[PDB]
Design a protein around this ligand. Structure first.
Ligand SMILES: O=c1ccn([C@@H]2O[C@H](COP(=O)(O)OP(=O)(O)O)[C@@H](O)[C@H]2O)c(=O)[nH]1
Length: 457
């Protein structure tokens, strides 16, 4: 009999992608029936394309479960981004999960970490085991678990964050996610509320492998990060592989990559939606041109779902596009990043250190030039450097900090990463370890097997 696992992803590709990969790992790898609770329509076209692809490619084990949201008035948060508005509407619809869980006849609920505080009580009331999928690194999970206790210790009767010493490394004050400094920030309220409820759930799934973050996983497993010493089991199931889809047309960028020599291309992406200020963007563009390397650069518009091919001329100038025409592919369109990373022609990935991108780089042994921008990115950047996955210049500024990282710094960094043999070798070693972990008898496979075991019981 196939256990029925219900998945509850939050909005955005950062959340949906891991959920989609987990759905396949459970169904194809471990014989589960998986239902993805999905709200229609999606906030963005990429999520909609991903769901449509997932339901066809993973049929019939992976299925759509329609989730109807309670009416939400967007006037409460004027000017708020559509992803946050979808998240808040979902959070308020948490009581509607109870009828959905009973209709689903769920063996277990796997809730997104951002919805955990509201999902867990509903699951608890219905007697359904509730597990949490954490979308970032084990280091971020340890910070998330520890942060409420850290705040409580500093709560004198009658603000911001300093160095956070997680029991069992130090997150320096400049690496703390910027929103956490403001206690009233919406990100901060959810980060604390979700962190507080982690100890009360059945288990936590993390898209990482024990060899990648040995200290963070050990501390979580030992319960070092909580006042009581109690913590639920931690399943290291990463890096989850990309879903196998069938494309019917090869994309131009893939064709362009094929025309380039092995490991000659620097791929540049700052994630699913990060958009950068014109001054930083100019330095980045100039740095790339100055490097002399072939590059594939994906630029994100500030408007969701806008493919602004003409904005390239407005944003960077016609001259830059003209000058780099023979060695670069620059686009504002969505690309299938997982495919690009598996291509032999890619030698370097300049990334924002979003966890999903990092897992993809780790899985394929691609060196990463870490350029963290906000949130968990600096914490993730440190992992890239320590692991040997890539290099991080700590001095480069991030959002809210003064000072432009120049074209010269970018060019030197790119040239060095491409130039030095050790960088590719170290990244390859990370790939080898990740491959060992996800294989049969590997720690990640073992974790998934144990998790499904509990679902069968
Ligand atoms: O043009 C793009 C931009 C992003 N991604 C994918 O979207 C995800 C980005 O998630 P991540 O955690 O890295 O960062 P975020 O988008 O949440 O900032 C990854 O799975 C990428 O492969 C993509 O496929 N194409």
């Amino acid at each position: 009999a196939r256990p029925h696992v219900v998945l509850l992803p939050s909005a955005g590709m950062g959340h949906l992608v891991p959920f989609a990969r987990l759905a396949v790992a459970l169904s194809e790898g471990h014989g589960c029936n998986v239902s993805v609770a999905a709200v229609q329509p999606t906030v963005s076209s990429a999520e909609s394309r991903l769901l449509d692809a997932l339901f066809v490619a993973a049929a019939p084990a992976v299925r759509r479960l329609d989730f109807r949201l309670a009416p939400f008035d967007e006037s409460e948060f004027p000017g708020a981004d559509p992803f946050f508005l979808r998240f808040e509407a979902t959070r308020r619809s948490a009581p509607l999960l109870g009828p959905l869980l009973d209709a689903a006849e769920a063996s277990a609920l796997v809730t997104d970490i951002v919805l955990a505080s509201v999902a867990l009580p509903v699951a608890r009331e219905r007697g359904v085991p509730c597990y949490v999928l954490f979308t970032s690194s084990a280091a971020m999970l340890s910070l998330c678990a520890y942060f409420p206790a850290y705040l409580d210790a500093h709560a004198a009767a009658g603000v911001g964050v300093g160095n956070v010493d997680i029991p069992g490394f130090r997150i320096p004050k400049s690496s703390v996610p910027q929103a956490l400094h403001d206690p009233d920030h919406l990100f901060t309220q959810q980060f604390v509320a979700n962190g507080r409820c982690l100890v009360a759930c059945d288990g936590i799934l993390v898209n990482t492998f024990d060899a990648f973050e040995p200290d963070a996983v050990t501390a979580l497993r030992q319960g070092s990060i909580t006042v009581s010493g109690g913590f639920p089991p931690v399943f290291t199931v990463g890096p989850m592989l990309p879903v196998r889809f069938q494309a019917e047309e090869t994309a131009d960028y893939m064709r362009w990559l094929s025309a380039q020599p092995p490991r000659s291309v620097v791929y540049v992406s700052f994630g699913s939606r990060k958009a950068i200020p014109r001054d930083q963007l100019r330095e980045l563009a100039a740095g790339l041109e100055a490097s002399g390397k072939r590059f594939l650069w994906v630029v994100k518009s500030t408007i969701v779902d806008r493919d602004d091919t003409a904005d390239l001329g407005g944003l960077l100038g016609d001259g830059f596009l003209e000058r780099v025409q023979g060695r670069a592919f620059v686009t504002m369109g969505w690309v299938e990043q997982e495919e690009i990373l598996q291509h032999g022609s890619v030698g370097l990935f300049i990334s924002h250190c979003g966890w999903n991108s990092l897992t993809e780089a780790a899985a394929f042994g691609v060196p990463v030039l870490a350029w963290p921008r906000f949130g968990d990115q600096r914490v993730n950047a440190a992992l890239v450097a320590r692991s040997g996955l890539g290099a991080w210049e700590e001095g480069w500024t991030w959002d809210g900090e003064e000072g432009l990282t120049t074209r010269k710094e970018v060019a030197k960094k790119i040239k060095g990463m491409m130039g030095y043999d050790a960088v590719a070798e170290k990244a390859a070693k990370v790939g080898d370890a990740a491959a060992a972990a996800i294989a049969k008898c590997g720690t990640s496979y073992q974790s998934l097997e144990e998790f499904v075991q509990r679902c069968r019981d």
